[PDB]
Amino acid sequence: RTEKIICRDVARGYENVPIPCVNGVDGEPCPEDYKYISENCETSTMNIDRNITHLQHCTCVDDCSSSNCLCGQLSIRCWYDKDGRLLQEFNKIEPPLIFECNQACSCWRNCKNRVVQSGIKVRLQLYRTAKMGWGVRALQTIPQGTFICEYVGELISDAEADVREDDSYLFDLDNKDGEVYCIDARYYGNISRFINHLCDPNIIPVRVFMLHQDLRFPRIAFFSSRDIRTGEELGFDYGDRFWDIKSKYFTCQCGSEKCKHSAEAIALEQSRLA
Amino acid sequence: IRTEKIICRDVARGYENVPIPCVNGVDGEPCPEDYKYISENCETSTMNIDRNITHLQHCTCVDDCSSSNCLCGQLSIRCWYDKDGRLLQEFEPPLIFECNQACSCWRNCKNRVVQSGIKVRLQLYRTAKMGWGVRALQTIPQGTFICEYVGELISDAEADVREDDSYLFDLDNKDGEVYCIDARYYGNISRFINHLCDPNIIPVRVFMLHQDLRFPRIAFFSSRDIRTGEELGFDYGDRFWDIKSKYFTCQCGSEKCKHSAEAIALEQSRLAR
Ligand SMILES: Cc1c(C(=O)N[C@@H](CCC2CC2)C(=O)Nc2ccc(C#N)cc2)[nH]c2c1C(=O)CC(C)(C)C2
Ligand SMILES: Cc1c(C(=O)N[C@@H](CCC2CC2)C(=O)Nc2ccc(C#N)cc2)[nH]c2c1C(=O)CC(C)(C)C2
Ligand SMILES: Nc1ncnc2c1ncn2[C@@H]1O[C@H](C[C@@H](N)CC[C@H](N)C(=O)O)[C@@H](O)[C@H]1O
Ligand SMILES: Nc1ncnc2c1ncn2[C@@H]1O[C@H](C[C@@H](N)CC[C@H](N)C(=O)O)[C@@H](O)[C@H]1O
Ligand SMILES: [Zn+2]
Ligand SMILES: [Zn+2]
Ligand SMILES: [Zn+2]
Ligand SMILES: [Zn+2]
Ligand SMILES: [Zn+2]
Ligand SMILES: [Zn+2]
Ligand SMILES: [Zn+2]
Ligand SMILES: [Zn+2]
């Protein structure tokens, strides 16, 4: 079947680049059972602290590439290299919080510590996969450590998440201390709502602070964990919490030799304990 | 002969769509730094703007929002944008409702002028008699968006007690409590726009990515064709000058000046008759 292009830009011009949609698998048209938003939204108010006097900020008179940058120190160091990519030694299993520079800092808008707030730069495509519904793939090579996109949706409380019927787009912010919040991309979301789980993932989520530092509401940034080839599907590890629940209802279709959540893998992890 | 020096390549530090340089060919005054340049309004207490996406009025247009059927255009009061993004008015103050994240239209539709930011080239420069001012670096057709009045959102009760009121902009909320934008400590290029009795820009209230009626945003549009080099200015209003004329008079130098010593005396002469 021909790979028809069915939307020139699912983001309707809201991103720095278009995100087209194609389907060469079945007759499903472009997905429209949600509202594309490029930045997080609220229905009920979350009362995010946006008091500018509450911000920690730097006093740098350079490009914030020195070890003197107070915003880099809020994460030990600035984990961005000169090209805006995560460093090699960056912890990819236990990422630190990133504090980017903000409107209170003395530095310029193009300092070295503003990667996520500058938006999508790589060419992505929404496409129909063979076995996992819609997915997202790269239309270019992407070096390791490159910012891909943010997990964008509706900010909700943990209590609201628990009464939501469809949890297939629910991202837990993992607030360890105090009030717990989630991003639900079911009704409002961006391209990230279509990114599938891979047991051999090529992107990782990182918690980032930009225009506010209300620690209840980290923003979720995906960075590539290795070099990604053109045409390669993007995916992150949804985590054992997700699969511990969902695997009762469906198993992983990633098809990797390393797959941890397939029907075969589940049967092995069960036949063992027996 | 004193030469003009470029003393800052961009007072906005890269936050605007274009750089806004500062020059001084008048005196020894250094680039103004007794404030924090911000490109968007800030808060220093709980304002918590209502951004509930489900409560935004929005349109369903599948075109570029150029038709009269666009709900957002229909909500706008006594004004509209032409095909080039220029504001036309009837001349009750105008009120603009731009399209937003809830509308079905694209980010580049015809009802997105103010939210797309500064497009005209402006310069902060030292004036002869009015301190710093802002002038055009290009021809600006009538109705063109110039810049937004940006600063610290405060309640009118807080505005009543601020010590330096030289940068205080009253939003004049009709229904509900009144709020103000104070650009004294945090502000953008607009904090430097002087009063002119022959003004060439006008402030217009606008809603964009929220419709929290406490906080219209203030957008300046040209009220006539402006030539390169002309100082930009708006009418600060009689309420400003009724109070401030005790302390200083208007130095705009226009033959139409309303607030010089001579104009005030003449107005007092007219009232006495
Ligand atoms: C992967 C991850 C998450 C996360 O929420 N995943 C989602 C899966 C992906 C969403 C796109 C769906 C998840 O588990 N949903 C979920 C769980 C249970 C039920 C039920 N019944 C329903 C839905 N939260 C953090 C991570 C991290 O890697 C690190 C962190 C600090 C950013 C914190
Ligand atoms: C001009 C204007 C305003 C406005 O606040 N001006 C400022 C002057 C300019 C600021 C850049 C300084 C103003 O008066 N300050 C002020 C008044 C009294 C005292 C004392 N003691 C101190 C300071 N507010 C609207 C307008 C309009 O034209 C229409 C509107 C609907 C947008 C509503
Ligand atoms: N590895 C996977 N194996 C099977 N199904 C998956 C896998 N990854 C994602 N999915 C499906 O996609 C859902 C998660 C969505 N956030 C991803 C986009 C989804 N594919 C869609 O078409 O809307 C899951 O709840 C599954 O239904
Ligand atoms: N027409 C005017 N005549 C005299 N002073 C003016 C005039 N317009 C503005 N000013 C001065 O500028 C102040 C308002 C500021 N928002 C404008 C920028 C100011 N010129 C500065 O250098 O910072 C007023 O309180 C006056 O001190
Ligand atoms: Zn810094
Ligand atoms: Zn910086
Ligand atoms: Zn900083
Ligand atoms: Zn798998
Ligand atoms: Zn419309
Ligand atoms: Zn609209
Ligand atoms: Zn529109
Ligand atoms: Zn005057």
Residue numbers in the entry:
A (entry chain A): 917 to 1190
B (entry chain B): 916 to 1006, 1010 to 1191
What does the report in the manuscript say about this coordinate set?
G9a and GLP catalyze the dimethylation of histone H3 lysine 9 (H3K9me2), which acts as an epigenetic repressive mark. Thus, G9a has emerged as an attractive target for SCD therapy. Our data suggest that BCL11A and ZBTB7A promote H3K9me2 by recruiting G9a to the BGLT3 gene locus, resulting in suppression of BGLT3 lncRNA transcription and subsequent γ-globin expression.
Further optimization studies finally generated RK-701 (compound 10), which potently inhibited G9a with an IC50 value of 23–27 nM, and GLP with an IC50 value of 53 nM. Like compound 1, RK-701 has a chiral center, and its R-enantiomer, RK-0133114, exhibited ~100-fold weaker inhibition than RK-701. Surface plasmon resonance (SPR) analysis confirmed the reversible binding of RK-701 to G9a but failed to detect the binding of RK-133114 to G9a, even at high concentrations. The pyrrole nitrogen and the adjacent carbamoyl oxygen and nitrogen atoms form hydrogen bonds with the main chain atoms of Asp1088 and Tyr1154. The pyrrole ring forms a π-π stack with the side chain of Phe1087. In addition, the aniline amide forms a hydrogen bond with the carbonyl oxygen of Leu1086, and its benzene ring forms a T-shaped π-π stack with the side chain of Phe1158. Kinetic analyses also support the idea that RK-701 is a histone H3 substrate-competitive inhibitor because the IC50 value increased linearly with elevating the histone H3 peptide concentration. On the other hand, a decrease in the IC50 value with increasing S-adenosyl methionine (SAM) concentration suggests uncompetitive inhibition with respect to SAM.
